[PDB]
Amino acid sequence: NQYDVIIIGSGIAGALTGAVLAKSGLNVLILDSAQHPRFSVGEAATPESGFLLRLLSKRFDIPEIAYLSHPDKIIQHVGSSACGIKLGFSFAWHQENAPSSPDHLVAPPLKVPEAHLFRQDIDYFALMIALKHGAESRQNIKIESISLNDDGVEVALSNAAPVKAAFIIDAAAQGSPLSRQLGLRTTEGLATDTCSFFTHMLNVKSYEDALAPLSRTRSPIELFKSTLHHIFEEGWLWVIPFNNHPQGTNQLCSIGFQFNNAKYRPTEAPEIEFRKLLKKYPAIGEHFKDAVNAREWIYAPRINYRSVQNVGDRFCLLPQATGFIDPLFSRGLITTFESILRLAPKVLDAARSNRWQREQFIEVERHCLNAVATNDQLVSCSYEAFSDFHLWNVWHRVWLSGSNLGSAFLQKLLHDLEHSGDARQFDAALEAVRFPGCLSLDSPAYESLFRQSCQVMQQAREQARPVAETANALHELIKEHEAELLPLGYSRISNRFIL
């Protein structure tokens, strides 16, 4: 075998996977059909993704991976166009045939700033980390076939010699050739059925200049410096600026709108569908008066999918190749970076002992399948919560309380790894969690709340219950479970900005 591991796809997942494996002593090859620079979606960084990036950096001793978790460090080391700032999430609610109220807004601010990842520069920077640590990159290739055997993997390429390796990691992310040929992908048993239009734009106005200033909204953060979600019955639109950091030089703002296909199926071209949306919601249109498009619209008719299995003797699909739900709540990078953190140590043990069996990577599958399953419950219920503001306001505390518990648990693992310096203890502690894939990670009290809350929302969809009844039901559940959650005051509805 020419190599130890072959990685398909040279975006952030594949490049970071290649970096840690090259650093750990494996002879790594990274294949890609596209080439850098190239555009990619997956821009909103979360607190969990920040800790998971810092864990990867510490666990495998690569300081440059930790630079991607903080916006100032991106600006300094990657480049000044490589990210915007993020001081939180903002969810502005809208209704067709009604003027938009500035009071219909929830915006839980963050403690430490996060990045809005300009992925063309971030993913190329991630590949450069892999290349500097000894990984080989081959771009612009054409995969003829991928053969899996009991003694190894063999990849055949157009106009080149075939390459061979012990393992193959699919990081190709929804153009996954290994997912196609194995017959793992399916949309069966998915609550979320959604499409997506997305692009990058110039001259997009800020929320403050377009809709309502800080004095009016009373928000502790500028929504300009946040992942802004414009939500409404049939779907949502995102405003993710890269031009919101003071030292930043990027002019672009990522814009993407999604529909629930059960409520609205788009019929016409992306630009026509966009203007029809701004007609429906004039408030959202205030962003795009003098705005112009910086690239083509991409239309994905169904972004949702999952897999029945995602590992074998000689392979392992990374989360994006495995399954995906929706941009909402930015769960893709969280699942991605955690799956690498779980996979990499097991691949090292396989490569070091020459044992390549499915049972060794079973905990990578269990996490990944549960994560997509959880996020499907989270998103499908969240899409149903868009129908009314008060319903959403109550509902988002279910997500937020889970995300805070999950962030604190990953922070605890980082704190123990930094002080103790014990890699095996960290790997075991991460594997020891009671609810792998879920939002809280380890808390049974939260998962009780989460799974009961989702039953209420699915009952509300199936029987078409009133929004006041559903909102009350969730409020009693929060009040029941509040004591076991963090002491933040999740139950008081009048507080729309949970510090």
Ligand SMILES: Cc1cc2nc3c(=O)[nH]c(=O)nc-3n(C[C@H](O)[C@H](O)[C@H](O)COP(=O)(O)OP(=O)(O)OC[C@H]3O[C@@H](n4cnc5c(N)ncnc54)[C@H](O)[C@@H]3O)c2cc1C
């Ligand atoms: C519309 C949309 C919005 C999203 N929004 C968010 C968000 O707000 N927050 C968030 O955290 N996540 C989001 N995600 C998920 C996000 O895309 C992933 O978390 C992340 O981008 C995955 O990185 P990656 O390197 O695996 O994939 P990518 O960055 O897409 O890289 C994959 C690479 O594989 C290559 N490739 C494809 N097919 C083949 C083949 N047959 N052979 C060889 N190479 C191939 C591609 O050319 C590409 O270079 C979103 C996804 C979509 C579709």
Ligand SMILES: [Br-]
């Ligand atoms: Br997801």
Ligand SMILES: [Cl-]
């Ligand atoms: Cl996501």
